[PDB]
Design a protein around this ligand. Structure first.
Ligand SMILES: *OP(=O)(O)OCC(C)(C)[C@@H](O)C(=O)NCCC(=O)NCCSC(=O)/C=C/C
Lengths: 48, 163
């Protein structure tokens, strides 16, 4: 159950809003590439 | 004061308590409708019919699910509305047991002025009033106002509101 209706699949981890596999790339790819690979050190990952 | 919509676990517990003709305390939420009713299938099936008319869609087998799991499964779809079965129950509580002239809207004005309770609380105070309906009509207006005042404190105890 998710907002009354029965749903099976991916949801946004924060908002619990359903996410279709097609939409994952438009919705998340920019954030994935931004926070992956060689990048500025992120204090949250290294004990501030 | 704050207007929070009426909980489905209170509504369901009132409807069962009204049907079984027992005090809200006498029905524990842990017991199932099949256990509570004590083998009287006709009463159990009238309860399931009241729940089906009140909320709409019901779980697979609601007589074997305890009143907790049934309350939270109703809450996932429950819009907060009074209901149709509760409309009739409250209409016939006010018409049959309140003094002539004292309608539902006059009680809704009185409890709003006295306690500062919005329409979402006033629903709850009227529902807890239903679960212990008085045997005879309250002839005097002041006895109807003393009952409504006592019911507000009992509703306030159940939810956890301080007036
Ligand atoms: O919980 P109760 O109200 O006691 O339910 C009555 C019960 C069905 C258990 C039974 O004792 C009863 O009423 N027996 C009398 C005969 C009767 O009513 N027969 C028709 C019942 S429905 C039927 O046969 C359906 C089959 C698919």
């Amino acid at each position: 159950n998710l907002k009354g209706r029965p749903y099976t699949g991916w949801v946004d981890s924060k908002t619990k809003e359903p996410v279709d596999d097609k939409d994952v790339k438009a919705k998340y790819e920019t954030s994935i590439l931004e926070h992956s690979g060689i990048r500025l050190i992120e204090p949250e990952l290294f004990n501030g | 004061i704050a207007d929070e919509p009426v909980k489905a676990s209170l509504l369901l517990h009132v409807l069962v308590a009204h049907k079984l003709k027992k005090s809200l305390d006498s029905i524990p939420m842990s017991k199932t409708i099949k256990d509570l009713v004590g083998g009287k299938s006709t009463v159990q099936n009238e309860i399931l019919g009241d729940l089906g008319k009140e909320f709409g869609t019901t779980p697979e087998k609601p007589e074997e699910t305890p009143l907790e799991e049934l309350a939270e499964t109703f809450q996932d779809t429950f819009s907060g509305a009074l209901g149709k079965q509760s409309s009739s129950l409250l209409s016939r509580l006010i018409s049959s047991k309140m003094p002539g002239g004292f309608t539902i809207t006059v009680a809704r004005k009185y409890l709003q002025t006295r306690w500062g309770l919005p329409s979402g609380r006033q629903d709850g105070v009227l529902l807890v009033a239903l679960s212990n309906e008085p045997a005879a009509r309250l002839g005097s207006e002041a006895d109807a106002k003393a009952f409504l005042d006592s019911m507000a404190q009992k509703y306030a105890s159940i939810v956890g509101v301080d007036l």
